[PDB]
């Protein structure tokens with residue numbers, strides 16, 4: 001009833017000119033955050049999903065591109081969706097994006113999944129604009145509620161025991177999936193450890209094994225690390241986001257790793273396209289590309 | 294911050310009575326957070342690459358069961374360890390008394406006269422509820438001839454990493 | 468896994484020790500075998516020769532399935548298989564008449580193997596972190612079970628035969644999708660640790676009171692709407708946590724009968740009033756957490772008999788005032804009243820001699836009442852996001868104060884008595900209207916963190932600030948600092964500290 005009304009009010013702006021905000025009352029957003037937090041705590045931190053599934057990269061508050069992605073892939077519950085994080089910051093409509101994602105998660109808990117990104121942190125939100133947008137449009141209480149909801153987000157997902165999905169990438173401390181299973185929630189993102197590397201690491205072709213990361217945190221890993229991880233864990237593909245790619249997707253370690261970026265025209269300064277990977281029952285991955293303006 | 298290759302592996306086992314704070318200390322050491330809720334632990338293993346005394350090492354901290362109901366394979370998990378942390382709560386006299394039993398169990402499973410271990414006094418922030426004084430803890434440590442350290446898992450953490458680093462140093466010395 | 472790209476198809480193109488250990492075990496005639504953490508994918512069939520084994524440890528491996536030769540190990544008493552890729556177990560395990568403990572945590576079992584239901588000799592069973600969706604009625608055969616943990620599964624209901632396991636002591640069904648608990652659970656009178664947290668339970672059976680030996684009951688994060696009165700018979704409970712439920716009222720005799728109740732948690736519930744009953748219901752609890760509720764009034768004299776209560780949490784409630792006996796809470800140590808509609812603090816607060824941590828953030832306070840300095844043992848004071856205009860001079864008597872937060876307040880000047888806070892280490896003055904800082908601020912030797920960002924009227928810093936040798940972190944963001952050279956301001960906090968020290972008289 002109320003959830004359907006919220007979803008309808010969020011989707012009624014589809015097809016209009018970008019920049020039109022959706023005015024939802026504070027109580028509805030707070031209820032969405034609370035119910036989404038309950039559902040997140042009701043599910044394992046390491047998701048085990050099954051095909052068919054749609055996998056999307058960073059959004060960063062570009063709501064109208066989220067709507068384009070839904071139009072291309074089909075609005076729920078037509079197709080299952082898996083998001084790799086970074087839904088807020090660096091966008092003019094972060095609130096609308098996060099509200100729509102939480103509403104879809106609440107309405108379809110078993111067909112809609114959201115992973116935690118590096119921006120889903122209080123420290124990052126306080127700096128990169130989400131706190132500013134929340135303060136401008138609402139009170140700081142809503143921002144704290146959003147932080148509480150984000151602290152319970154799952155970290156990694158596995159699709160058909162062959163595809164490993166995470167925001168950042170591999171970690172030197174990651175030797176078994178039970179280590180991810182033992183991460184407690186709710187939790188803030190630390191500056192070091194397994195969670196920090198899982199949310200911040202990036203691949204690099206110039207690194208043989210592990211190397212320093214230009215972001216000032218976590219580590220970079222090469223193709224050999226990816227191959228060894230896949231061989232040890234009997235996986236086939238690593239699906240990641242975190243990094244901007246011109247074509248919306250880019251293969252690494254001879255197609256053993258794929259980086260997905262879903263927001264075209266990132267921050268208004270890049271000419272990159274947004275891509276979404278579709279996985280069928282036969283694990284025949286295919287990419288749908290949103291052409292830039 | 295990049296670990297080197299062929300790092301030595303140290304297997305650390307945390308033992309003690311139920312509710313003393315072994316899991317909280319381990320989570321604070323690894324995840325850098327404090328878990329306010331209590332959940333009995335059967336067995337949990339954690340791995341971390343860290344540099345101690347300018348030497349990189351792999352720490353494999355193993356968390357055991359403090360409750361007799363959940364302590365089914367505790368001896369087997371202790372048998373595979375290289376160092377032990379005997380953790381007791383300063384607010385619980387029974388946990389401090391069971392330190393002797395845990396030390397005897399470690400000696401029996403290892404079949405050695407002495408073994409690298411450290412006595413850990415947890416929950417020292419709860420000064421109003423503290424029942425075991427520092428003098429009693431040092432006396433217990435001096436009798437068993439083992440290092441003594443007081444830790445607090447609640448934020449802000451107190452010597453949480455120091456206990457594990459000291460245990461690694463003791464393992465290296467012997 | 469394959470990729471349909473570029474109008475074509477692309478693909479992601481990339482046990483001697485075990486045998487020696489088995490031979491060594493056979494030669495030594497050892498009764499224990501440890502093959503854990505060896506990356507074993509297929510267990511060699513030669514293990515059948517080790518008929519003398521009583522303990523087998525195969526955990527932390529990559530075993531897809533166990534060979535049928537394991538059934539020849541009739542003398543096995545312990546079988547550890549945790550952290551593997553097992554999807555089923557061979558039927559040859561029926562021969563293991565002496566098996567007492569089975570460990571199957573962190574596996575890929577879609578259901579409990581049928582052979583497990585025939586291992587009636589089992590006393591401990593672990594099935595955590597599996598894909599099990601149902602429990603068959605054959606569980607009744609495992610009457611000798613004393614420890615059963617099936618948490619972190621997709622089980623939606625439990626069979627009525629669960630009540631025939633009279634030997635159960637601990638039952639763990641947490642983190643499942645259970646919606647109802649069968650009334651037969653009361654027949655397991657020996658249960659002392661029952662875990663029901665993170666489920667979808669709507670109500671508890673009235674037979675739960677038959678668990679006279681129950682000491683731990685996990686009910687947090689469920690859909691419970693009421694607590695049956697039979698729970699009062701479980702007087703051995705030490706903690707009652709009811710976080711994140713729909714409970715709005717409690718039985719009158721529930722908390723009174725819980726003589727051993729040391730802590731009570733009612734957070735994130737639908738409570739609009741305190742539980743009905745006398746002060747005796749809180750006489751035994753050490754801590755009382757009732758945050759995130761809709762409580763608007765604290766009953767008068769509710770904590771008169773609560774001599775042991777030390778921690779009270781009322782964060783995010785509908786409180787608009789405080790009871791007249793607020794000063795009688797002499798046993799209080801930590802008090803949290805954040806996120807409420809409080810407009811003033813009564814003068815009776817001076818009677819809280821034992822108070823150490825006081826949180827009053829996110830309220831409508833405009834001035835701190837006189838007599839706040841009587842809190843000798845006060846250590847942490849939080850006043851973030853309030854409407855404070857000025858601070859009383861009695862704040863100088865807080866000798867034990869270590870952390871003070873005044874972010875997002877209408878304060879204009881600080882009292883000259885702030886320099887007497889020798890134990891103060893943290894001072895948050897951001898988003899205030901501070902025109903200047905008092906010269907006494909330099910006497911705070913133990914001050915380590917000072918926050919002054921977003922102050923629009925802070926045009927100058929006192930030269931005594933350089934005397935704080937322990938000052939390590941300072942925020943001066945967005946400050947005008949029109950009375951200082953722009954180069955030093957743009958240099959950073961260290962440059963400002965150096966300039967203050969060099970020019971210090």
Ligand SMILES: Nc1nc2c(ncn2[C@@H]2O[C@H](COP(=O)(O)OP(=O)(O)OP(=O)(O)O)[C@@H](O)[C@H]2O)c(=O)[nH]1
Nearest residue numbers: 311312313314315316317329333334359445446447
């Ligand atoms: N205040 C405070 N509480 C603590 C501290 N360390 C542990 N606790 C509390 O101790 C209780 C039990 O913590 P656990 O980590 O589960 O203890 P444990 O001994 O590992 O538990 P078992 O595995 O059941 O034996 C929880 O309520 C913790 O929050 C501490 O330093 N300070």
Ligand SMILES: [Cl-]
Nearest residue numbers: 086118119242
């Ligand atoms: Cl980023």
Ligand SMILES: [Mg+2]
Nearest residue numbers: 315316333334
């Ligand atoms: Mg534990």
Ligand SMILES: [Mn+2]
Nearest residue numbers: 086117118242
């Ligand atoms: Mn990112």
Ligand SMILES: [Mn+2]
Nearest residue numbers: 058060086242
């Ligand atoms: Mn990003």
